[PDB]
Amino acid sequence: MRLSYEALEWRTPIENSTEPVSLPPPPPFFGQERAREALELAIRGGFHAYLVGPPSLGKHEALLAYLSTQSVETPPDLLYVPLSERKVAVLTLPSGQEIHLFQRFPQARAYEALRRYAETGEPWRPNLLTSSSSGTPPPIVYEPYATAPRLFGRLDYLVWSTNVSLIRPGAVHRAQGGYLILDALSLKREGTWEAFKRALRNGQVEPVTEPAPAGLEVEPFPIQMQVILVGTPEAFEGLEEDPAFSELFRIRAEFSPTLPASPENCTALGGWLLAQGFQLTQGGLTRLYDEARRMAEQRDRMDARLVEIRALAEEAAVLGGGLLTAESVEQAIAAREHRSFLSEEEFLRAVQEGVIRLRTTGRAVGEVNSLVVVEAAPYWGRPARLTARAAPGRDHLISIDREAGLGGQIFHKAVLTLAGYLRSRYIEHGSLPVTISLAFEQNYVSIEGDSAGLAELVAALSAIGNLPLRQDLAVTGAVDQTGKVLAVGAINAKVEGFFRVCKALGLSGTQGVILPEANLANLTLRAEVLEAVRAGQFHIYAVETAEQALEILAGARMEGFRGLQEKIRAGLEAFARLEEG
Amino acid sequence: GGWLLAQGFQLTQGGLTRLYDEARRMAEQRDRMDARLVEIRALAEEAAVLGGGLLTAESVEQAIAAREHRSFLSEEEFLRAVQEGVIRLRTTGRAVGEVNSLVVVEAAPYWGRPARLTARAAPGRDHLISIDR
Amino acid sequence: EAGLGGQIFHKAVLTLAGYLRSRYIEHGSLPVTISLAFEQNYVSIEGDSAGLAELVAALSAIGNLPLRQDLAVTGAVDQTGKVLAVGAINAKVEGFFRVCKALGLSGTQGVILPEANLANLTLRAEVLEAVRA
Amino acid sequence: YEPYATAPRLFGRLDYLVWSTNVSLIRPGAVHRAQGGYLILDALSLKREGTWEAFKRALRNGQVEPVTEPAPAGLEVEPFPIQMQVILVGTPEAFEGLEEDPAFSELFRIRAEFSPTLPASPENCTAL
Ligand SMILES: *[B]([O])([O])[C]([C][C]([C])[C])[N]C(=O)[C]([C][C]([C])[C])[N]C(=O)[C]([C][C]([C])[C])[N]C(=O)O[C]C1=[C][C]=[C][C]=[C]1
Ligand SMILES: *[B]([O])([O])[C]([C][C]([C])[C])[N]C(=O)[C]([C][C]([C])[C])[N]C(=O)[C]([C][C]([C])[C])[N]C(=O)O[C]C1=[C][C]=[C][C]=[C]1
Numbered sequence: 025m026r027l028s029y030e031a032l033e034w035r036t037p038i039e040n041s042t043e044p045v046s047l048p049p050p051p052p053f054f055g056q057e058r059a060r061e062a063l064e065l066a067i068r069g070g071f072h073a074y075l076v077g078p079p080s081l082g083k084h085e086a087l088l089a090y091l092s093t094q095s096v097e098t099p100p101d102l103l104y105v106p107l108s109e110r111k112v113a114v115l116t117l118p119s120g121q122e123i124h125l126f127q128r129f130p131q132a133r134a135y136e137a138l139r140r141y142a143e144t145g146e147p148w149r150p151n152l153l154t155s156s157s158s159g160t161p162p163p164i165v166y167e168p169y170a171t172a173p174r175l176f177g178r179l180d181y182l183v184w185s186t187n188v189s190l191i192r193p194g195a196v197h198r199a200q201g202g203y204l205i206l207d208a209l210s211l212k213r214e215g216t217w218e219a220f221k222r223a224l225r226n227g228q229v230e231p232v233t234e235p236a237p238a239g240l241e242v243e244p245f246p247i248q249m250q251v252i253l254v255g256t257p258e259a260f261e262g263l264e265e266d267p268a269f270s271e272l273f274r275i276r277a278e279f280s281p282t283l284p285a286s287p288e289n290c291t292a293l294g295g296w297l298l299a300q301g302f303q304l305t306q307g308g309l310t311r312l313y314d315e316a317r318r319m320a321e322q323r324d325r326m327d328a329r330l331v332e333i334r335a336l337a338e339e340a341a342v343l344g345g346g347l348l349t350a351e352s353v354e355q356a357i358a359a360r361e362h363r364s365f366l367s368e369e370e371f372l373r374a375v376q377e378g379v380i381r382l383r384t385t386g387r388a389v390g391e392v393n394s395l396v397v398v399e400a401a402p403y404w405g406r407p408a409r410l411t412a413r414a415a416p417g418r419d420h421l422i423s424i425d426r427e428a429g430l431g432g433q434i435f436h437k438a439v440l441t442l443a444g445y446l447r448s449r450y451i452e453h454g455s456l457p458v459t460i461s462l463a464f465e466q467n468y469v470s471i472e473g474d475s476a477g478l479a480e481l482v483a484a485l486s487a488i489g490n491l492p493l494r495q496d497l498a499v500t501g502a503v504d505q506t507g508k509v510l511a512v513g514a515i516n517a518k519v520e521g522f523f524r525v526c527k528a529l530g531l532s533g534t535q536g537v538i539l540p541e542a543n544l545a546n547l548t549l550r551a552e553v554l555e556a557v558r559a560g561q562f563h564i565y566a567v568e569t570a571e572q573a574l575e576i577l578a579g580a581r582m583e584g585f586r587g588l589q590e591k592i593r594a595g596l597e598a599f600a601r602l603e604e605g
Numbered sequence: 606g607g608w609l610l611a612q613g614f615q616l617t618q619g620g621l622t623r624l625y626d627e628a629r630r631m632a633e634q635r636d637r638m639d640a641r642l643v644e645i646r647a648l649a650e651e652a653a654v655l656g657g658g659l660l661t662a663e664s665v666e667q668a669i670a671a672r673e674h675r676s677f678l679s680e681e682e683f684l685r686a687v688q689e690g691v692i693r694l695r696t697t698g699r700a701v702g703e704v705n706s707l708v709v710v711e712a713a714p715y716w717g718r719p720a721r722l723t724a725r726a727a728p729g730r731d732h733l734i735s736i737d738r
Numbered sequence: 739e740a741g742l743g744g745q746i747f748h749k750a751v752l753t754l755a756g757y758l759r760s761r762y763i764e765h766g767s768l769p770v771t772i773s774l775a776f777e778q779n780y781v782s783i784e785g786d787s788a789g790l791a792e793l794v795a796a797l798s799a800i801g802n803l804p805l806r807q808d809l810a811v812t813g814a815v816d817q818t819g820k821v822l823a824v825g826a827i828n829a830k831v832e833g834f835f836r837v838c839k840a841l842g843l844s845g846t847q848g849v850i851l852p853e854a855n856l857a858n859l860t861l862r863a864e865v866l867e868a869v870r871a
Numbered sequence: 872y873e874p875y876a877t878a879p880r881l882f883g884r885l886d887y888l889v890w891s892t893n894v895s896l897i898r899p900g901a902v903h904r905a906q907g908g909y910l911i912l913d914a915l916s917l918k919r920e921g922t923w924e925a926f927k928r929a930l931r932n933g934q935v936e937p938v939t940e941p942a943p944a945g946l947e948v949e950p951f952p953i954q955m956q957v958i959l960v961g962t963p964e965a966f967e968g969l970e971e972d973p974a975f976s977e978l979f980r981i982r983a984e985f986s987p988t989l990p991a992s993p994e995n996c997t998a999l
Contacts, residue, residue: 428749448725461756
């Protein structure tokens with residue numbers, strides 16, 4: 025099918041573009057149902073939990089604002105008192121009562137043991153770590169740098185003695201009765217994971233010393249706190265492998281990477297941006313909300329990384345003189361593309377130069393513009409010339425790039441899948457009477473993935489049938505063994521990448537891309553491409569099957585003979601007779 | 606039951622039975638029951654919260670479904686993709702040389718999924734090709 | 739085969755075989771084994787810029803066709819036998835010119851190269867003069 | 872412009888006057904010298920000197936800690952809000968080590984890339 029400009033347009037209509045936006049701030053966790061509820065369970069329950077999600081989602085700021093709304097019992101007076109002249113204990117009192125100093129501190133049993141100094145002339149002070157007014161909002165402590173001294177506190181040395189009073193508190197102490205938030209990465213990096221389990225599992229909390237001369241034994245004590253860990257899916261694996269982890273950290277609070285694209289979340293993003301201090305106009309909200317849809321390559325979802333959105337917004341603001349407008353956002357996007365365009369501008373020059381040989385008009389046998397992406401941020405796409413050559417052979421399909429060690433495993437798997445199709449689909453001669461060689465003509469680099477399977481197979485079929493294919497249409501799609509075409513990824517980059525090549529060489533009017541029907545909802549194409557489609561200057565075909573892609577390329581149908589199919593048969597028969605006479 | 610009570614739980618007969626059955630379930634054994642007292646306790650502490658301090662059949666069934674919810678993101682993404690046609694699967698009809706096999710994905714908690722499997726045959730010299738291998 | 743060629747070198751060799759096999763089909767499969775060597779090389783060689791020299795050499799061995807040894811060759815080839823741009827062109831050309839000048843110029847010496855690399859020719863004066871002469 | 876990115880050179884240092892210390896024994900670091908203005912560093916150097924994480928903590932969290940020796944009593948010194956624009960300089964390759972760190976792109980949003988070559992024009996001959 026042909027996809028009309030109307031089918032392609034996915035942007036949000038804008039009305040009153042300059043109007044200021046006025047909106048109240050969404051609560052912490054909007055569009056994050058699962059993570060909110062996990063976190064709620066963990067709070068009502070006293071459980072430790074972990075916050076997991078990809079980078080730049082704003083997991084931290086949401087957690088902190090969410091904890092600021094919590095309320096609980098004002099935190100006890102918290103302290104170290106001596107038991108010996110070499111020993112110290114952690115104690116809790118009911119609050120504020122330690123401005124004091126039987127006696128009326130009966131909770132402090134042992135400190136006996138300040139008991140008989142002048143039965144000798146045998147010639148100290150109880151220390152406070154924390155105290156406080158209210159359990160609203162609770163202690164929330166966020167130590168992003170998880171070193172031992174920062175977690176467990178420290179012992180300093182006053183010349184060379186020490187006593188309770190020289191003991192400095194650590195995050196763990198500051199968080200008693202409340203929250204300690206840590207980064208998964210940091211505990212890993214700082215090799216503090218085991219020592220921190222011992223603090224949770226066994227009450228073990230040891231202030232750091234220097235490599236002498238006399239230390240202080242300090243007893244375990246019961247730990248009062250809820251700890252939340254934050255990091256990525258990947259940040260966690262190192263941890264999970266430790267059966268202790270799941271035991272200690274029962275509640276997973278997972279963020280989704282994407283949100284439904286709904287009015288409520290557009291509206292929510294609007295208030296969220298306003299609370300952040302932006303001066304936002306309706307046009308500036310719509311473009312940003314659409315870029316979020318675009319960032320997720322999902323017409324119906326919107327990318328959930330609030331921090332990425334904010335960062336782009338801060339760029340648009342500068343370009344709009346402090347005002348966040350539809351134009352300033354469209355310009356801050358185009359400037360980011362400009363800032364990273366050097367490699368592409370070199371490619372286009374080379375192509376224009378004939379240094380990279382590409383065709384974008386005309387026809388040729390056994391050649392096709394496939395589409396690749398180059399694997400560094402921001403993942404530009406480009407056409408890559410693909411050739412297929414056929415000769416009398418013993419059912420051999422040669423992937424040249426694989427054989428030379430450039431193809432990856434998935435690339436290899438696609439090549440095998442297509443050979444499964446060819447061998448099985450054409451059987452009159454018994455085994456296939458041809459050797460077919462496939463190359464990505466100017467490639468010097470590893471290529472990996474299955475998204476060139478459709479280009480490979482039409483190229484094969486063209487070489488077998490001697491069938492000239494349109495070079496003004498590029499191809500992307502995976503295939504299965506039955507020759508159905510399967511969805512692939514990075515589609516916007518692929519299409520926009522052939523459009524740049526065509527525009528650099530000068531548009532014919534007939535250029536386009538063929539792609540899987542399966543990827544219709546991923547098309548969130550940039551304006552210039554959409555306009556060109558609206559103008560009849562560029563075209564998008566979507567298919568379900570390899571043979572559909574072939575009929576568009578060879579400008580003919582598989583049957584209604586004079587079809588393509590009888591010519592493919594006639595090619596195979598000829599290759600069969602050459603293989604035995 | 607007595608072990609849970611000594612631990613301080615307020616346990617009802619329905620809350621014992623569901624937990625004892627989850628233990629059977631955890632061991633994938635109708636006739637055996639998983640012996641990890643600590644796992645059982647940890648689940649029970651979740652059910653208790655959901656039952657307001659009381660450990661009931663419902664609170665256990667709900668504390669189980671919530672654990673599945675807390676780890677369902679990857680599955681909810683898979684189902685969306687399948688519904689979308691992004692993963693091509695068939696669940697009605699017939700076809701030659703195709704079958705829904707079943708796999709599990711190897712991270713806790715080990716969700717299972719169907720995975721489309723195709724077999725193609727041609728005139729050949731006794732060759733069976735495992736493409737994934 | 740002896741482990742001196744790199745991956746891109748190998749890829750060029752395969753590309754040219756793709757061309758040969760496909761371009762000459764009367765006999766079915768190609769009725770020849772063709773061996774190619776870089777006669778005094780002891781070291782890794784890598785890149786596709788010898789594909790054009792390799793293929794004319796193949797064609798000469800097949801046809802028994804004597805080739806001019808006063809012209810050197812550089813260029814890559816694709817499967818259709820088109821010649822493709824390569825790199826370090828000034829060094830290549832000026833390098834055959836030194837060899838020829840050291841052995842004493844015939845008057846007829848030169849280099850064949852891809853048309854695609856015309857804009858890369860920024861040849862040193864002595865080479866330009868010799869062309870002028 | 873601190874081309875040698877060691878901790879003491881970035882964050883400054885604490886010296887010890889016999890064995891005590893106090894505010895007045897605290898020496899400034901590049902980061903302090905650059906407040907309100909520009910700090911230029913080499914990508915390679917932060918890599919080489921293993922100072923990348925400590926420098927993120929200075930930007931991300933205000934964390935700026937003057938170096939001590941392996942005792943006996945230190946000084947706690949609070950974070951403070953950082954006033955500066957930092958520019959990093961290096962090669963395409965010098966950056967990859969860094970980019971792999973999702974923190975990098977977050978902290979260092981604006982890529983300023985030089986082209987390797989210029990058009991050959993009269994204006995650039997004249998400019999040269
Ligand atoms: B498809 O699955 O999307 C597709 C199939 C290919 C075209 C046969 N694969 C890709 O586009 C992959 C993308 C993925 C690995 C990020 N691209 C590559 O493997 C590319 C291919 C070349 C032709 C650009 N290889 C690559 O990125 O690796 C080497 C390299 C990376 C960055 C810069 C320079 C070289
Ligand atoms: B059967 O023996 O149970 C079965 C046979 C398979 C389907 C042919 N094997 C599995 O289900 C194994 C389970 C075991 C290794 C834990 N699963 C896998 O090997 C899976 C298979 C895919 C299709 C899900 N591979 C896998 O888990 O590895 C990669 C990976 C793991 C986790 C997340 C993402 C990728």
